[PDB]
Design an enzyme around this catalytic site. Structure first.
Site: not given
Ligand SMILES: *[C@](O)(C(=O)NCc1ccccc1)[C@H](C[C@@H]1CCNC1=O)NC(=O)[C@H](CC1CC1)n1cccc(NC(=O)OC(C)(C)C)c1=O
Ligand SMILES: *[C@](O)(C(=O)NCc1ccccc1)[C@H](C[C@@H]1CCNC1=O)NC(=O)[C@H](CC1CC1)n1cccc(NC(=O)OC(C)(C)C)c1=O
Lengths: 303, 306
Positions: B41, B143, B145
């Protein structure tokens, strides 16, 4: 989100750990530049631990009586010096894995990571706090002496603890890296006991702020308190007094959550009175006191 | 003595962590030999996340479209491949800090250490269990991931987890290092929830043995039981079934303490029915289920890594 007891990554300390042997006694040392730091009781026999004269035992030792092993490598000891309860062994090699480091003496309530080691090899890493009675609730077996406690705020390792002993309640005592014990303890097998332990009140408040940041509000109430009335109640539960310094330290978490420090104190007073009635806070059924205000901000809001 | 939630020393893994950027997205990667592993992703933007075509998205990408940074050093990407929900970025340089490693997929109930990382920099290490509902109770911000979970055996790192997402209730989901999800989750922005979780029975019994080894003995009693009897009470309280294999794994701790698993199951049977009656075990007011039998032996025998 989520909230865990988190240690610092241990790699920067792992590359500093060595085995030190003197006679029959083996324990851990810390190799920074050209000095290995270890507990001075490496020079003692198992009998003659009641009243060691360390000055007398050390003058009798040759550089060649200290076997220092870093993996397969034997390091050459070229000089030795005692500082309080720590022995400094000069060696012919600077550790090439030496990190950016400082020695810091911490206050009760402060947290740090422990890299538990046996025979100069790491076993595990966990988080601890310096208790108000200057003990730590560690996890240490025979062979753990010379294991260290540290923080890594940025790329700089602050060493704050060196392991020396287990006290009768199954808690632990040790020194800073200048060899001064935390608390009134001595490196002798004489009868010693930890004072009555108390709960680290400012940390409990920080952790209730963490719970609110992570979306839990069930324990809040409509009450406030004076600082003095809070302390009169909290001390009946063997809580440490909360000072105006602690109130100041909680200012940022107060501002983030919009809950005044003395309103959060009123919440704690009610929790001490009621318990949790089958509920949990951040996965715990007890009030947690081993997260500092600085730990909460670092874990909740960006690192 | 003492008993702490202990993570593996993280040094072998810290040397493998890098930053991976593709356009707007920065997250972490794992650099082993000449390949960087990260979540697929990383290729997505805002629009893409709602219903992504990962095949179609990965075609349009240069090798120079993926910025890989190990400290200040830019690695050169000379290949890219997808494996399930993982991207594999071929680089021109083998990681000279690559440990002895393999990729393993763990079972629900098994524990591992997480090295939480941001922008390729390790920030913290903690111990997790794969929950029966295939989530972990992690602590991860924007961040995180591409942060990984691992075990160490002698000098061999077993990588078992790579972080992808947060669910409602603030629990976490990810893949093994071959990009297969743990649990019924998908890497898209869509309605997903953790299933009803259960308590890992064999781990609670392991932790009662740790309690006894550390002199905490108040819950021991004269009674014994059998599997069927205990298991009928387990199902009742949303505990995992206790199998005969679990009874065998606890074998050592039954010997070392004089409390037979089914004698200890009699103690655990009583705790579930009656509660703890104001008491604590190893400083907890709840029954701990994130220590495996191996973890308890590891910790209480002082096993070290080479
Ligand atoms: C991961 O992609 C990540 O760290 N990406 C880098 C990044 C940089 C700047 C801003 C955001 C992300 C994240 C890890 C998340 C972020 C907060 N806590 C984590 O464990 N994963 C996602 O954002 C993930 C990607 C999707 C699977 C492909 N994602 C996307 C959309 C929604 C959610 N979850 C969500 O809405 O969580 C609740 C609890 C409902 C708020 C999600 O994890
Ligand atoms: C430390 O010296 C060590 O690890 N030494 C290496 C070693 C010891 C034994 C066998 C092989 C190798 C230990 C660390 C202790 C041991 C158990 N858990 C620990 O944290 N420290 C001591 O043994 C210490 C040395 C004293 C300060 C100079 N010491 C000595 C004698 C008695 C005690 N404590 C004790 O009796 O504890 C109770 C709980 C009362 C049994 C002690 O810690």
């Amino acid at each position: 989100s989520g909230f865990r007891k988190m240690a610092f990554p241990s790699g920067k300390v792992e590359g500093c750990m060595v085995q030190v042997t003197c006679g029959t006694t083996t324990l851990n040392g810390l190799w920074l530049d050209d000095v290995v730091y270890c507990p001075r009781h490496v020079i003692c026999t198992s009998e003659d631990m009641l009243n060691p004269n360390y000055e007398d035992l050390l003058i009798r030792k040759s550089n060649h009586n200290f076997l220092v092993q870093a993996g397969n490598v034997q390091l050459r000891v070229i000089g030795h010096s005692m500082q309080n309860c720590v022995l400094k062994l000069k060696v012919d090699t600077a550790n090439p894995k030496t990190p950016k480091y400082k020695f810091v003496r911490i206050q009760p309530g402060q947290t740090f990571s422990v890299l538990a080691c046996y025979n100069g090899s790491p076993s595990g890493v966990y988080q601890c706090a310096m208790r108000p009675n200057f003990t730590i609730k560690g996890s240490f077996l025979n062979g753990a002496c010379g294991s260290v406690g540290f923080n890594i705020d940025y790329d700089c390792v602050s060493f704050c603890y060196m392991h020396h002993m287990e006290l009768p309640t199954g808690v632990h005592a040790g020194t800073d890296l200048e060899g001064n014990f935390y608390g009134p303890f001595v490196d002798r097998q004489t009868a010693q006991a930890a004072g009555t332990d108390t709960t680290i009140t400012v940390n409990v408040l920080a952790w209730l702020y963490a719970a609110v940041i992570n979306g839990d509000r069930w324990f809040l109430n409509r009450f406030t308190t004076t600082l003095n009335d809070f302390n009169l109640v909290a001390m009946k539960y063997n809580y440490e007094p909360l000072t105006q310094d602690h109130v100041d330290i909680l200012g940022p978490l107060s501002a983030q959550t919009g809950i005044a420090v003395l309103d959060m104190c009123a919440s704690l007073k009610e929790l001490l009175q009621n318990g949790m009635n089958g509920r949990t806070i951040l996965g715990s059924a007890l009030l947690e006191d081993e997260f500092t205000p600085f730990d909460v901000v670092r874990q909740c809001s960006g690192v």
